[PDB]
Amino acid sequence: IPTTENLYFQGHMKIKIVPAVGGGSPLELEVAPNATVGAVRTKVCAMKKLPPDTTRLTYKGRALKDTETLESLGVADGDKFVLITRTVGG
Amino acid sequence: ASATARVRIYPLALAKVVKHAASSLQREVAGLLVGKSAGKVLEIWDAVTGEQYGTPAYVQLDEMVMAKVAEELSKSDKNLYIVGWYHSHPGLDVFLSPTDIDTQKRYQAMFSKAVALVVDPVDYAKISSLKFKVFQISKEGRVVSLPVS
Ligand SMILES: [Zn+2]
């Protein structure tokens, strides 16, 4: 058993992130309830090759702060989030 | 030059954008473009909107509109998704301001073939047509007006 195999199985909560723009595959991430929304969004941005300062995650009708923990939101295995970006004309 | 070669807009979708813009000459309005790519052709199947705040020079669509729309589209069996945004420039002519370009760069980062439709309801092109363009940021960072049909 590789020492990093343990790290591979940390947690058993899988969540789905839907990018709001485009038809791209949803991401399915294995997380822990102690994970922050920010850690999730960072991972999603890395996978989609986005910069870190342009998006926000939303969950059950609310935009989330990156400092919120998944545990504080009552997130369950299989839950879905949407990754949004701003729509502003100026 | 640019990720999208041309844009095909369903006439009723264009009509909805036009009517929304024409219904608020006193402020910029905004919404979302729904559709899909087919190769390098971007298809705009529909236009939707929701809660927003705007003035003659500015508009922000509530971010929960995009969230709700993407989730509905994602759930449905239809293979359609958000492909862009629209907003109006009443009496200002059709272009992307620095703010618009910033918004559009963020759309394109998420979906390379995304587009920004800008309409000025008080003007008519040239035979007559509505005064709109569909923009994209090119690979070298320039605003380009895409062919539309
Ligand atoms: Zn604008």
Numbering used by the authors:
A (entry chain C): -11 to 78
B (entry chain A): -3 to 122, 126 to 148
Which text from the study accompanies this structure?
The first complete archaeal Ub modifier system, including E2 and E3 enzymes, was discovered in 2011 in Candidatus Caldiarchaeum subterraneum. C. subterraneum Ub (CsUb), E1, E2, and E3 are organized in a single operon, adjacent to a second E3 protein and a JAMM protease (CsRpn11) with high sequence similarity to eukaryotic Rpn119. We have shown that CsRpn11 is highly active on its own, cleaving both CsUb precursors and, at a later stage of the ubiquitination cascade, CsUb-conjugated substrate proteins. Our bioinformatic, structural, and biochemical results reveal unique features of the archaeal proteins, but also remarkable conceptual similarities with their eukaryotic counterparts.
In an attempt to obtain full occupancy, we soaked CsRpn11Δ149–202–CsUb crystals with ZnCl2 and indeed obtained the structure of a completely Zn2+-bound complex. Unexpectedly though, this structure now represents a later step in the catalytic cycle: In addition to Zn2+, a new catalytic water molecule is bound. It is found in the same place as in the unliganded CsRpn11 structure, but in the complex it displaces the CsUb C terminus into the second coordination sphere of the metal, which can be regarded as the initiation of CsUb release. The structure of a completely Zn2+-bound CsRpn11Δ149–202–CsUb complex depicts the next step in the catalytic cycle, where a newly bound catalytic water molecule displaces the CsUb C terminus to initiate substrate release.
